[PDB]
Design a protein around this nucleic acid. Sequence first.
RNA 1: UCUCGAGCCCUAGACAGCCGGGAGGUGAGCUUAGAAGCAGCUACCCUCUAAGAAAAGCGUAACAGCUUACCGGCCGAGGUU
Lengths: 29, 70
Amino acid sequence: IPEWKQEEVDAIVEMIESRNTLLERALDD
Amino acid sequence: GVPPTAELIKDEAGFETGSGEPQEDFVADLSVDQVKQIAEQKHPDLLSYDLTNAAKEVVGTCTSLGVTIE
RNA sequence: UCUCGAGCCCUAGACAGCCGGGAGGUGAGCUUAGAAGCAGCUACCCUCUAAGAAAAGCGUAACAGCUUACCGGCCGAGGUU
């Protein structure tokens, strides 16, 4: 459960509002 | 196109050489506005979008030569 | 080759391999006829960014060139000390 991975999932979700695995994770959110 | 940074500095500095050991031996100086001008002349050479960051790159070669800022 | 223990990494995709990326300011300054990642000395800073050293190793008279770090993909199960 690396922290940098969690910070990325957030950063992605942040741009979605305004790694492929991390993109999908964010989309699901 | 536009000449390199190392040179553009030595012009508005008045000095020709840098320093044998940077940040320990302050040779030249630079005001903020003077750096704003240099930030304009290298827009094509630099990757930064804002003039804010454009400055930071130029400001990133100075102190490593003994170029204090005020 | 067999057996037992400890730590760490892993389906938020690990270890390896293959593909792609390895960018700019800038060939950093100094020194030097020249030195541009890589003779030496000092520093080792910021941009774009998913990465990318003021360069870990070969290579050049010096560039080039070949890759290392670092990032991304393919793959898919354990891997590593």
